[PDB]
Amino acid sequence: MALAAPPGELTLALTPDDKTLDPASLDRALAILAEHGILVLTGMLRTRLTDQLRTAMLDDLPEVLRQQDVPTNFVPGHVQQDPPVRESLLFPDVLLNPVVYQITHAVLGADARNAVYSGNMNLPGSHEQPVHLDEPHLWPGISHPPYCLCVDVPLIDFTLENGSTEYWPGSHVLNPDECYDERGCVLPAELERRRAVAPPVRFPIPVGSVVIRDGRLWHRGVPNLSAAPRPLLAMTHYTEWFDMPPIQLPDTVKSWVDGSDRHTHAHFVAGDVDHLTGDHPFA
Ligand code: NI
């Protein structure tokens, strides 16, 4: 709560040149994800990539807001927006990042696969989301290991002002009976018990960072009190055995996406994919 940079205990500092973590860096990464459920990797992505993705998503926001019903996460101002899947905006260092997949391989296995290429546009004057998990526990009242890791790419500097996400460290292992409602929101009794032992944190995250977290981590989107939309690009790695629909990608990227040992659950389509309406033929 009210930090000035990502906490040391959650953070691993890299450069965009780093292709693998040395054994001790990986051990620390996995120790952080196991204990805290969230890992911040600073210095992962070049300005060249984040700038293009930021531009592409801010250019698409008008088409998203024109929709009959604008799909929002829980409350007003938290808009669901898929980034483009044009050949020229699909970057191996984003989709198939070698450090990300080194971590996800070590936690979920070599057959783990990305099955989400989506985004969260947090609008100026947005409301507070309820504390929730994005992915549920597979059975109520059971402790089990992760089956999915969210990979979140901020496309501007996230600040306390513009809606940097509230995270509940270590919350990813909590699954008592009657803890979650049908939408994945944490029952208030469990929130206040948890707050006494391990209160939530919120911190700036500079663009170029990648956040990897347990899909079961408690978090909430919070108001964007800045004058500008706060874009996030979102991917999710799942174990091979978890049923997900495939990502629609153009067959122009099949050559490097298919037959990588960094797996994507993908359906390849002739021609352009409509990333926003999703309505294209042969989908
Ligand atoms: Ni969420």
DSSP state letters, 197-239: HS--B---B-TT-EEEEETT--EE---B-SSS-EEEEEEEEE-
15 Cα: distance to centroid of ligand 1 (angstroms): 28
Given a contact cutoff of 8 angstroms between Cβ atoms, the answer to whether 156 and 47 are in contact is no
Tell me, in angstroms, the distance from the centre of ligand 1 to residue 281's CA: 30
d(CA 279, CA 270) in angstroms, rounded, equals 14
How far, in Å, from the CA of 136 to the mean position of ligand 1? Answer: 11
- Superfamily assignment of 8-269 in CATH? q2cbj1_9rhob like domain (2.60.120.620)
Resolution to one decimal, Å: 2.5
CA of 12 to the centre of ligand 1 (A): 23
What is the SS3 assignment for 149?
strand
Tokens of 100: 């990300």
**Other beta carbons less than 10 A from residue 108's beta carbon:** 21
Å from CA of 220 to ligand 1 middle: 6
Distances (CA, A) of 176 to 83, 124, 139, 169, 186: 36, 36, 10, 17, 11
Residue 109, both tokens:
């296995």
Residue ranges per structural domain of the chain: 8-269
Q: What is the DSSP string of 110-122?
A: TT-EEEEEEEEEE
Residues near ligand 1 ion, CB 5 Å cutoff: 134
Tokens of 131: 């504390």
Q: Ligand 1 centre and the CA of 124: distance in Å?
A: 18
Q: Which amino acid is at 67?
A: Q
CA distance 122 to 230: 5
Way it was determined: X-ray
Q: What's the gap in Å between 261 CA and the centre of ligand 1?
A: 28
